[PDB]
Design an enzyme around this catalytic site. Structure first.
Site, PDB file in Angstrom:
ATOM      1  N   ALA B 192      35.846  47.253  33.372  1.00 57.71           N
ATOM      2  CA  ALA B 192      36.990  47.947  34.141  1.00 57.71           C
ATOM      3  C   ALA B 192      36.622  47.423  35.071  1.00 57.71           C
ATOM      4  CB  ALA B 192      35.673  49.146  34.092  1.00 57.71           C
ATOM      5  N   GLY B 208      36.414  42.041  37.018  1.00 61.29           N
ATOM      6  CA  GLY B 208      36.202  43.318  36.603  1.00 61.29           C
ATOM      7  C   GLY B 208      35.112  43.875  36.307  1.00 61.29           C
ATOM      8  N   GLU B 209      34.871  45.076  36.444  1.00 61.38           N
ATOM      9  CA  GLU B 209      33.008  45.277  36.473  1.00 61.38           C
ATOM     10  C   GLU B 209      32.636  45.121  35.637  1.00 61.38           C
ATOM     11  OE1 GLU B 209      34.674  49.722  38.002  1.00 61.38           O
ATOM     12  OE2 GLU B 209      32.616  49.050  39.681  1.00 61.38           O
ATOM     13  N   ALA B 210      31.220  45.354  35.261  1.00 59.89           N
ATOM     14  CA  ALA B 210      30.646  45.159  34.561  1.00 59.89           C
ATOM     15  C   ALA B 210      29.373  45.832  34.726  1.00 59.89           C
ATOM     16  CB  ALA B 210      29.541  43.840  34.211  1.00 59.89           C
TER      17      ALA B 210
END
EC number: 5.1.3.24
Lengths: 349, 342
Positions: B192, B208-210
């Site tokens: 995200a 991005g965020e995992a």
């Protein structure tokens, strides 16, 4: 029959067995649950506390550590529209009471299976919540406009199987934490309405819909024996078209797969490029009973009447089938017992 | 500022460019949309018809065949709860009018990216709608009960990245049919807040965020000449999310974003709540892939709009340290070397 008749006609419901006590509910029973002690001389369905989450079709349930868990299903949202749920309810038999858990499954659950492995409930399969819910949102918006309805149906059914995003992930619910975890995923595809059987470190997923109106004759094995979960395609059953809503259990060390419903010729249509694989076809109900014995399938017996979408439970080293739907979509109240006296099936009803 | 100041401070919004005209809206601009003609000598923002789907943070957009499409985002449902949307709206710039399409994406879309290839809008990434929506449902149920809030938060953050089901599928939307199709899936994992850049048959997904509070330093390359490649990482070891990405003279730029220094280490040492206690840092770094650090922004910035403009990366708005949205725009150009215009 082999048990007393269910108190109401009983299709699309769910149930579980805790040793000798059978629990059934939902589907065409509405919010009703019943229990039966199979060891009583005077076997009787006893009405339990009502399910507080409203009616559910295609829910699943698991007994773990003395409590009954119910997962998902199809029913009405607060706006009155049909939708898929992602929730978990817990029933405590000692207190005859339900609670909804504060627990959020990452995927809606309808057409999913559920099995218990090492104290956890494992879930795979099912429709995509957004696609399924959106279909009913669209029909509601269309109202009585038949041209609008036709467009919605045309768009809905004219897709490849992958475009329906049936759930290929394997999820695990831990009753102690009430949390959901990633447990794995199929190397292939998810189905809706597969039959599940679990025995120790093996679980089998039999047939199911690959998309609305198209079933698979596949049989998948999940092998938990090693350090890493392994997925295998086994020999198929109910070929070529497959069924959905079949019944399944284990008798000795041989799998029993019985009944289910489908659209004859649909696999060939899809293979021939017709995405709407079951257009114009009538649903038929299988009477076949297949036994998976010494690692091989054979047609080994038959049901008296075609049947799908009931409850399958292990009982006395046999497959106990309770309720279901027969030709014309008619729900039934009777039960069947399928036992293997090797290497052959026997049917009691 | 390169372009005129945005009419209001502008973070978490979305935008698109069609030839000479830049379109921006949503995020902290609420339902407002604006356009700007980049060829005018007195450049200005002109108000457009308001978005009818309510305010959206982290929506995406695509301009395809003369129409602007807006996908998903985070906003409020009918009952006032924060949630992830899965919808598509279409804006016709000729009539200055919006319509909500009858179209159902198979996943919620927030933190997703969107890019155009062969006349279709491709989407990947984003949070899981049930997990995200469930969090706000639980906080709504809990009310003022601190004990309950603490329990909700503890459960939410104490999971492995895989347990958040960030979207690893690649979805395609065809404007001609308004339908969604399976286009593929990542061999790795979804994120995200990745930054996306597309050029021809290649698309890059950067960082991005995992999972909530944990970013990746990964860089993925999608090749439609579909093959999925993992490139050398950037912003190692922790990564950022909400960064800006573009191409300039064949060089792939990655700028800005925000992260939590030492979170990957915590996660690797078994602390699932990898960012517990930490302050966000906003990056001024600019990297070029050849990855080499090649320049610096004047202030850390994340969660604005990135657009290709005149073989440069145009950055519009964004969020800064402390959460302050900004109104200014920045231009980044690459000869093997970076130049930041402010």
């Amino acid at each position: 029959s082999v048990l007393p008749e269910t108190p109401v006609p009983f299709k699309s419901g769910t149930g579980a067995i805790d040793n000798d006590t059978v629990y059934i509910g939902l589907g065409s029973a509405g919010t009703a649950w019943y229990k039966l002690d199979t060891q009583a001389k005077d076997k009787k369905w006893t009405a339990l506390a009502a399910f507080p989450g409203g009616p559910r079709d295609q829910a699943t349930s698991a007994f773990i550590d003395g409590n009954l868990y119910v997962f998902g299903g199809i029913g009405k949202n607060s706006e009155g529209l049909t939708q898929v749920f992602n929730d978990v309810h817990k029933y405590n038999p000692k207190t005859n009471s339900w609670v909804k858990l504060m627990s959020h499954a990452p995927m809606g659950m309808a057409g999913h299976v559920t099995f218990v492995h090492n104290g956890k409930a494992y879930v795979t399969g099912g429709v995509n919540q957004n696609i399924f819910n959106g279909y009913f949102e669209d029909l509601n918006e269309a109202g009585k406009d038949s041209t609008a309805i036709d467009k919605i149906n045309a768009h809905y059914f004219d897709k490849k199987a992958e475009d329906y995003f049936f759930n290929k992930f394997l999820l695990s619910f831990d009753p102690s934490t009430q949390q959901w975890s990633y447990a794995g995923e199929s190397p292939w595809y998810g189905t809706a309405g597969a039959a599940v059987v679990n025995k120790g470190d093996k679980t089998w997923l039999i047939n199911g819909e690959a998309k609305p109106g198209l079933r698979t004759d596949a049989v998948f094995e999940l092998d938990f024996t090693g350090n890493n979960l392994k997925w295998n395609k086994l020999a198929p059953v109910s070929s070529p078209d497959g069924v959905a809503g079949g019944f399944a259990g284990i008798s000795n060390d041989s799998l029993i797969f019985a009944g289910g419903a489908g659209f004859k010729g649909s696999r060939e249509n899809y293979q021939n490029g017709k995405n709407y694989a079951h257009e114009g076809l009538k649903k038929s109900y299988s009477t076949d009973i297949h036994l998976w014995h010494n690692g091989k399938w054979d047609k080994s017996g038959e049901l008296s009447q075609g049947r799908a979408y009931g409850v399958s439970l292990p009982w006395n080293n046999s497959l106990l089938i309770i309720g279901g739907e027969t030709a014309g979509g008619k729900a039934v109240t009777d039960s069947v017992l399928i036992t293997v006296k090797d290497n052959k099936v026997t049917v009691q009803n």
